[PDB]
Amino acid sequence: MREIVHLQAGQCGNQIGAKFWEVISDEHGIDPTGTYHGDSDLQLERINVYYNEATGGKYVPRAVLVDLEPGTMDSVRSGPFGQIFRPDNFVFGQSGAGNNWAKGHYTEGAELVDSVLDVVRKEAESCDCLQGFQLTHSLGGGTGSGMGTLLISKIREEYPDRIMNTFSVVPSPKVSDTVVEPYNATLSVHQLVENTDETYCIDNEALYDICFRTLKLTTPTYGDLNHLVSATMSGVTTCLRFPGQLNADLRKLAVNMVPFPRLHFFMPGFAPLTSRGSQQYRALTVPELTQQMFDAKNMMAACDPRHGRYLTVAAVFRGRMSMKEVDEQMLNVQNKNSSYFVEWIPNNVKTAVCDIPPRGLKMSATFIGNSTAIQELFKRISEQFTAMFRRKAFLHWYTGEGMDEMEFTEAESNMNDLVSEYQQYQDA
Amino acid sequence: QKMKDKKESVYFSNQRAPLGKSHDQTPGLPKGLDILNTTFGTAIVRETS
Amino acid sequence: MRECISVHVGQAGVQIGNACWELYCLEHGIQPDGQMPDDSFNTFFSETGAGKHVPRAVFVDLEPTVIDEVRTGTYRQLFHPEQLITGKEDAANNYARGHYTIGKELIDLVLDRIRKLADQCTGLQGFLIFHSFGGGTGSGFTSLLMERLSVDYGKKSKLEFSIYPAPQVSTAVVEPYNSILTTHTTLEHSDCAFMVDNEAIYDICRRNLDIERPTYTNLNRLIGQIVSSITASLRFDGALNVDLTEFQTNLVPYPRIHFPLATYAPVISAEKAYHEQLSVAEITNACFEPANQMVKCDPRHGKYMACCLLYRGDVVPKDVNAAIATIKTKRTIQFVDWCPTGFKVGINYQPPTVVPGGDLAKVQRAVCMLSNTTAIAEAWARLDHKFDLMYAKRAFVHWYVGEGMEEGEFSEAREDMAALEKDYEEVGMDSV
Amino acid sequence: MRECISVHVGQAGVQIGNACWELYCLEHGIQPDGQMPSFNTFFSETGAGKHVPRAVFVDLEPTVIDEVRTGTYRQLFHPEQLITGKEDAANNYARGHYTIGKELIDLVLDRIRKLADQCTGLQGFLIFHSFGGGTGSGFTSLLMERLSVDYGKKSKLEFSIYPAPQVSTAVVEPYNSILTTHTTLEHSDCAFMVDNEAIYDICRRNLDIERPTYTNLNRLIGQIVSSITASLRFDGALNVDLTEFQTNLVPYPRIHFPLATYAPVISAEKAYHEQLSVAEITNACFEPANQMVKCDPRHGKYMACCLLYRGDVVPKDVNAAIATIKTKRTIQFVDWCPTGFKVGINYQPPTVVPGGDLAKVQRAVCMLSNTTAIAEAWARLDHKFDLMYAKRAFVHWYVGEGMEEGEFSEAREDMAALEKDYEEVGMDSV
Amino acid sequence: LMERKGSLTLRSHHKKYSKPVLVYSWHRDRETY
Amino acid sequence: IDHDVSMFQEPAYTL
Ligand SMILES: Nc1nc2c(ncn2[C@@H]2O[C@H](COP(=O)(O)OP(=O)(O)OP(=O)(O)O)[C@@H](O)[C@H]2O)c(=O)[nH]1
Ligand SMILES: Nc1nc2c(ncn2[C@@H]2O[C@H](COP(=O)(O)OP(=O)(O)OP(=O)(O)O)[C@@H](O)[C@H]2O)c(=O)[nH]1
Ligand SMILES: Nc1nc2c(ncn2[C@@H]2O[C@H](COP(=O)(O)OP(=O)(O)O)[C@@H](O)[C@H]2O)c(=O)[nH]1
């Protein structure tokens, strides 16, 4: 009765979502054949959120899995938890779309979104009280952006109060994995600003710096980047699925974040991560734990908060933990380091603690940060956009379905407005 | 005879330019490496997953 | 279920197919008969209920010598004999004979066969064209092939593994005439024309690989190696899968500018692979080297417009990103100003297989480059200078005009190349 | 971590290289093949076990390098680091800086730009050449110029076999040498120098072995390159990286030409019957009849020395030995050098290249010393260049192979400054 | 109607849950336990 | 702000 529905779009969205159901199957203890084989009763205490219940005693994840590329479709199907999914919400087309953002909204996106929302409607009207929707995708590919933002747009037509919790993957600062990534980013975030409520920005270069330096992992594969992403994935829904002395579902984690309806781009983070060679050299206490939360190194978005002010900050917590110092230390990080928080939000940072740990650590936490330093991530990509658009770099692929030059104008104008808002509230 | 004509024709400029082979693989490689079943270059042990 | 069809037209196209298809058979376990002793093979190999695998390929060639070689060779039981389309008399380096007189006779057969390939497949992905430039049926029949596949299919991706006539070495005396006229039909519906020559392979087979005296086979095995690396992601699971149409829509910046180069980095002998370390940071270092290039052109006199990186083997996304990062700051390689960071990466978990009797080692990792450069305008202009200098005194024209061609089609090719020369000048300039 | 790509250029270069990389391998237990039945600073690595070395052996004449590609040490070297030409430089610099060696400049610089890519902290390049040769005095000067433009501040040390005092094996030696010391004086952070005649004498007084061959001499030079790049490899108390040699031996800028002297050069009949101590070994390095460069140091004010002890050396003993050396007034030291001693100590004992002339000693000391007594050395060479140039002899060859007759005057002129510089850095302080 | 596979057709407005699982009606079900 | 120095003082990390 505070149920949320899962959404996966694009190859990056599928593999992140696949490894999310790897993780949730550990704290909820659901085996790859779906059955309960855990120990604690608190484990199946709020399983109704990410799962629906059972004919025969198993828990299929409520995850519609859309991707027009079938190569990632059987790749997740053949994974270790591809069996736990249901074949019904394996919605996919045999045809391919090579970063065709026009095709992803008007001709083949339109012919597929009816099939996709025929699944999403089934999983939304079948619940006592829907709390919201949440989607994981990439801003670079055409299926991550085109199918991603089209599903965000048409859901909001009939859902007034159900929040949308997008988990976004932004192109990297140093290099790109696709040359048309600024094009597929700018057009997609033109639909993310109006229609989403939380957009968690994940950066690949940020994940590399956490893995190489803090985790001391020389060769992190995609089974390791997604697990850091999946830590925050379960981190935002901690209190919603388990009891705590101060709970916070997604929706009081929304009003406590967004001052105005367009400032909803957040920095995710996981606090207690340390390399194997130095587990026994660092003491796991919440004074030590929340420092690694707030350093610029353990930030999953690759833009330095030192170049801006935090607007609103939360830190969700787990484990049997003292409430005095989690309250008194977040006094201390506000007040002694006060030039990097906005002065017009005095009681800036909130806490949201939980009684149960994750599987592996005695106490843990997950960082969410809404700062005005993320406009640099949007200022530099408008610069990456205005270099291509002044020469009409790759316009003739996008005009395959007759989307005009006029649509790119407000696509770029939405960013210049958004950056102008972020610079306006930087200086109050 | 052309089998003999190439056998007396070994210690030639055909040493460094044979037909399809590059030049006989023995003295530049340690003993018998089984060139079809050998995978050159270093790899990662892939520990600490 | 994703598949694409590879037609091999011309004597160069058949022999490339004669040496690349056994690499495709060795990469999935297909015996020379075709019985395997996993739906990976269902992108180039169809299925018969007996259990044996036909290649999804049609071989059309007017010359009967090279087609009857594979019918009487060790691949008699490899191809479908009705798919193996032979001709009667060859165009003989005559564009007007592959386009007008002899070519039009065999079009109704090859297009009917391609329709039969496309009819029995649930999802088609693209087209791979394999031809040359200096031929008669590699230049004229492929002109009919792209004029009719465009009207019959349309929005499907069409890719070409063509052979550019070398700037210094040549085979036929009339190569520039065919090479200015067969690019007229690749400027209308050819979606992405991969380019390679015959003499930069020679320097690669000499310096990097250690053979003197290379035949046609060693050239085409290498070409088979680089075709396989591009299309390995349509048949094998990878960390970042690339589709055939995904890199088609971002490697080509302008519809006229669809001529990327090619590069296979670890072209190393078995002796030297014991010796030199094979990390990811050195193979992508060797891609940008002008010596390790598959078209006789100098990259440092031009600007890279887009780059596609197709890795395979034991690579992880971190150290490839670090390697691209440290090589972008190198000043001797320069991009064009309006393009941002333009690399497109592709990762595959399948290492390259080595053919027995080959000249390459079993390397754990490899990388393919498809880079669209402004430097190829130097190759286009030199060929343009070769054509107009010989066309000024109207040489070798009566063979062309005597086989269904007008005098003006040479002129119509001239301003088409003038447009193809001016646009390369208009894309290399700075944006201000 | 630490890496020293060593471009061995010249015949003397590739021969010095052979002897040097032999000890360099018999010390890091790497068989002549490359597979071992800390060294990354002089031995790269594949995966299986191949420890392919790190070096660019270069010589424009396929004979003195084709033997390294066919002999015992064949597998070790990578067939792509032993670059070779097809035409000699004919002991004429003109065919080393302008012609003949203008085709190999690309191949070599590129093999280098790959040996470095693998490194993480190249601490410096060590060229090894011969001033009296052609390639040795040509592609050395050329490689030096291009290397600087590219690589950069990267220390460019040089170990050169400078023309002997009266002994020589070439008539055009004077020219090549004076011309090479003009296109290098500004592109070489430092330049250790050893002359053959001298090393012959030491292998007759100390190592009682008449009829010495260039191999016997190359072994002594090899056991000197070890005591310079030992700290970089083996561990020890006071360790000196290549960067320190450049800021402890070169006093003023242009004046950058350290000498050299190994000390426990003893036979076997001797070794056993003598208590080779840190004191006896120090004294040796300073005795004129033990300098690897025939230039009596008694006619010069030692600018700055740098004793590098190796083996079982107690730090206290070095303090004593040095103090006594400073006491004697026979050894003079410039006033502008109140200190003048870089004590380096590595615990790894000097190894004994089998079939050699040295005897397993428990200690050792190599003193790259800068004296104003190298002025006399360049004076002899300067004189034997103003003798022939006057009769404009052997200038027909050079001026024909690209070189212009101007660089000859320019060479003597620049060298005049170096001999006038070695005069002002030796005068008293008012 | 073309795709319209049967598992998609089988929808619901109320969802059943097991006895450990806490529905709104869970205190209602333990009360008649 | 003016914590007592008679007991533990609690930490003061920056960003
Ligand atoms: N890479 C490669 N190129 C080839 C090979 N054989 C021929 N070529 C090239 O093909 C060119 C000849 O043109 P083609 O298209 O093959 O000839 P054609 O159109 O079939 O006409 P015919 O030669 O009469 O059969 C030559 O210039 C060669 O460069 C080969 O085995 N490998
Ligand atoms: N220390 C030492 N000096 C050598 C050795 N071999 C030759 N030399 C000296 O090198 C001097 C001439 O320089 P080289 O390097 O031999 O001349 P080069 O120009 O390299 O000769 P090419 O490469 O054949 O053209 C001779 O006077 C020798 O004294 C050696 O093995 N060790
Ligand atoms: N963190 C993470 N990022 C991924 C993964 N797979 C792909 N990506 C990112 O996705 C981007 C490419 O998007 P793409 O897969 O082509 O999107 P699509 O074609 O629409 O499915 C690249 O920049 C990658 O960084 C993954 O497993 N983990």
Kindly write down the DSSP assignment for every residue of D225-247, as one continuous string: HTTTSSTTSS--SS---HHHHHT
Enter the tokens of residue D337: 């050098």
Rounded CA gap, D83 and A263, in Å?
A: 62
**Contact with chain A for residue E8, Cβ under 8 A:** yes
- Which residue CA neighbors atom 10 of ligand 3 most closely? A12
Enter the tokens of residue C104: 């039009």
Largest CA distance in chain C: 64
Rounded CA gap, C104 and C101, in Å?
A: 6
Rounded CA gap, D342 and D225, in Å?
A: 17
Q: Is-catalytic flag, C89?
A: no
Closest residue in B to D71 (Cα) is B27
At a CB cut-off of 8 Å and minimum separation 6, what does C368 contact?
Answer: C226, C229, C230, C262, C263, C264, C308, C309, C310, C311
- CA A103 – ligand 3 centroid, Å: 19
Identify the bridge partners of residue D307 per DSSP, sorted by sequence position: D367
Closest residue in A to E17 (Cα) is A53
Measured between beta carbons, the chain B residues lying within 8 angstroms of C270 are: 22, 25, 29, 35, 40
Q: Which ligand is nearest to the CA of C166?
A: 1
**Cβ atoms of residues D196 and D294 within 8 Å:** no
List the subunits that have 3+ CB pairs under 8 angstroms with E: A
Pocket of ligand 3, candidates A169, A170, A203: which has the most ligand atoms within 8 Å of its Cβ, to mutate?
Answer: A169
Reduce the DSSP state of residue C3 to 3 states and report it.
strand
Query: Going by DSSP bridges, is the β-strand pair D365-367/D307-310 parallel, antiparallel, or unpaired?
Result: antiparallel
The rounded Cα D78 to chain-centroid distance in angstroms is 24
Q: 10 Å Cβ neighbour count for A331?
A: 14
Locus of tokens 């008007």: A106
Closest residue in D to B28 (Cα) is D75
Rounded CA gap, A415 and A424, in Å?
A: 14
Reduce the DSSP state of residue C161 to 3 states and report it.
strand
Establish whether A142 is an annotated binding residue. yes
Measured between beta carbons, the chain D residues lying within 8 angstroms of C271 are: 79
**Cβ atoms of residues A48 and A3 within 8 Å:** yes
Q: Which ligand is nearest to the CA of C62?
A: 1
- Which residue CA neighbors atom 12 of ligand 2 most closely? D133
Rounded CA gap, B31 and C318, in Å?
A: 37
Nearest to A180 by CA among C329, C260, C251: C251
**Cβ atoms of residues C112 and C83 within 8 Å:** no
Identify the bridge partners of residue A6 per DSSP, sorted by sequence position: A63, A134
Reduce the DSSP state of residue A286 to 3 states and report it.
helix
Locus of tokens 């119509």: C412
**Contact with chain F for residue A323, Cβ under 8 A:** no
Rounded CA gap, D160 and D170, in Å?
A: 16
C25 residue type, one letter: C
Give the CATH class of A375-425: mainly alpha
Burial class (CB in 10 A: 0-12, 13-18, 19+), D375: buried
Radius of gyration (Cα) for chain F, nearest Å? Answer: 9
Declared resolution, Å: 3.5
**Contact with chain A for residue F2, Cβ under 8 A:** no
For chain A, the structural domain boundaries read: 3-257, 265-374, 375-425
- Which residues of C make CB contacts under 8 Å with A? 1-2, 39, 122-123, 125, 157, 234, 237, 239-241, 243-250, 253-255, 306-307, 316-319, 321-322, 324-325, 328, 337-345, 431
C290 residue type, one letter: P
Nearest to D279 by CA among D244, D322, D238: D322
Cross-chain residue pair C278–B41, CB shorter than 8 Å:
yes
Pocket of ligand 2, candidates D7, D9, D11, D176: which has the most ligand atoms within 8 Å of its Cβ, to mutate?
Answer: D11
Residue ranges of alpha helices (H) inside A307-374 are 323-335
Nearest to A265 by CA among A156, A428, A50, A415: A415
Establish whether A69 is an annotated binding residue. yes
Within 13 A of A325's CA, how many CA atoms are on the CB side? 15
Cross-chain residue pair C240–A70, CB shorter than 8 Å:
no
In DSSP notation, C57-119 reads EEEEES-HHHHHHHHHSTTTTTS-TTTEEE-SS---S-HHIIIIISHHHHHHHHHHHHHHHHH
- Which residue CA neighbors atom 7 of ligand 1 most closely? C12
**Cβ atoms of residues C246 and A99 within 8 Å:** yes
**Contact with chain B for residue C355, Cβ under 8 A:** no
**Cβ atoms of residues A422 and A375 within 8 Å:** yes
Q: Which ligand is nearest to the CA of A142?
A: 3
Rounded CA gap, C134 and C173, in Å?
A: 9
Nearest to A171 by CA among A222, A211, A148, A137: A137
Rounded CA gap, D214 and D220, in Å?
A: 10
Enter the tokens of residue C168: 């210094």
Which atom of ligand 2 is closest in space to residue D138's alpha carbon? Answer: 19
Q: 10 Å Cβ neighbour count for A155?
A: 21
> A265-374 architecture in CATH?
2-Layer Sandwich (3.30)
Cross-chain residue pair C276–D52, CB shorter than 8 Å:
yes
**Cβ atoms of residues D249 and D351 within 8 Å:** no
Reduce the DSSP state of residue A220 to 3 states and report it.
coil
Q: Specify the CATH superfamily of domain A3-257.
A: Tubulin/FtsZ, GTPase domain (3.40.50.1440)
Cross-chain residue pair A218–B46, CB shorter than 8 Å:
no
Ligand 3 binding pocket (C-beta < 6 A) is: A 10-12, 15-16, 138, 140-144, 169, 177-178, 204, 222, 225-226, 229; C 240
Rounded CA gap, D234 and D231, in Å?
A: 6
Residue A346's alpha-carbon distances to A267, A349, A350, D57, in angstroms, are 20, 9, 11, 69
C312: part of which helix (H) or strand (E)? strand C304-313
Rounded CA gap, D329 and D327, in Å?
A: 6
Tell me which method was used to determine the 3D structure: cryo-EM
Residue A192's alpha-carbon distances to A165, A415, A420, C31, D376, in angstroms, are 10, 11, 17, 52, 81
Establish whether D169 is an annotated binding residue. yes
At a CB cut-off of 8 Å and minimum separation 6, what does C329 contact?
Answer: none
Which atom of ligand 2 is closest in space to residue D88's alpha carbon? Answer: 25
Measured between beta carbons, the chain C residues lying within 8 angstroms of B22 are: 209-211, 269-271, 359
- Which residue CA neighbors atom 30 of ligand 2 most closely? D12
Rounded CA gap, A68 and A79, in Å?
A: 19
Reduce the DSSP state of residue A9 to 3 states and report it.
strand
**Which residues of D are known to be catalytic?**
244
Interface size C-D, in CB pairs within 8 Å, comes to: 33
Rounded CA gap, C428 and C374, in Å?
A: 7
Radius of gyration (Cα) for chain D, nearest Å? Answer: 21
> Backbone breaks in chain C (C–N > 2.5 Å) follow which residues?
37
Which 8-state DSSP code applies to residue A147? I
The rounded Cα A257 to chain-centroid distance in angstroms is 15
- CA A232 – ligand 3 centroid, Å: 18
Touching, F vs A (3+ Cβ pairs under 8 A) = yes
Rounded CA gap, A5 and A123, in Å?
A: 7
Torsion from C-alpha of D199, D201, D202, D206, nearest 10 degrees: 160
* Binding site members of C for Mg(2+): 63
**Contact with chain D for residue B39, Cβ under 8 A:** no
C318 residue type, one letter: K
Reduce the DSSP state of residue A28 to 3 states and report it.
coil
Reduce the DSSP state of residue D44 to 3 states and report it.
coil
Which atom of ligand 2 is closest in space to residue D91's alpha carbon? Answer: 19
Reduce the DSSP state of residue A169 to 3 states and report it.
strand
List the subunits that have 3+ CB pairs under 8 angstroms with A: B, C, E, F
The rounded Cα F9 to chain-centroid distance in angstroms is 3
List the subunits that have 3+ CB pairs under 8 angstroms with C: A, B, D
Cross-chain residue pair F12–A336, CB shorter than 8 Å:
yes
**Cβ atoms of residues D75 and D33 within 8 Å:** yes
**Cβ atoms of residues A236 and A248 within 8 Å:** no
Rounded CA gap, D390 and D397, in Å?
A: 16
Rounded CA gap, A408 and E13, in Å?
A: 42
- CA C240 – ligand 3 centroid, Å: 7
The 3-class secondary structure across D242-301, one letter per residue, is: HHHHHCCCCCCCCCCCCCCCCCCCCCHHHHHCCCCCHHHHHHHHHCCCCCCCCCCHHHCC
Cross-chain residue pair D117–C274, CB shorter than 8 Å:
no
Rounded CA gap, A207 and C61, in Å?
A: 53
Establish whether D218 is an annotated binding residue. yes
- CA E31 – ligand 2 centroid, Å: 103
**Contact with chain E for residue A39, Cβ under 8 A:** no
**Cβ atoms of residues A217 and A10 within 8 Å:** no
Query: Going by DSSP bridges, is the β-strand pair A130-136/A163-170 parallel, antiparallel, or unpaired?
Result: parallel
Question: Is the dihedral angle over the CA atoms C381, C368, C133, C243 positive or is it negative?
Answer: negative
Radius of gyration (Cα) for chain C, nearest Å? Answer: 21
Identify the bridge partners of residue D158 per DSSP, sorted by sequence position: D127, D191
In Å, how far is C351's CA from the nearest CA of chain B? 10
- CA A376 – ligand 3 centroid, Å: 22
Which 8-state DSSP code applies to residue C353? P
**Contact with chain D for residue C282, Cβ under 8 A:** yes
Ligand 1 within 6 A of CB of C336: no
Establish whether A123 is an annotated binding residue. no
The percent helix, strand, coil of chain F (3-state, each to 5) is: 0, 0, 100
A317: part of which helix (H) or strand (E)? strand A310-318
A235 residue type, one letter: G
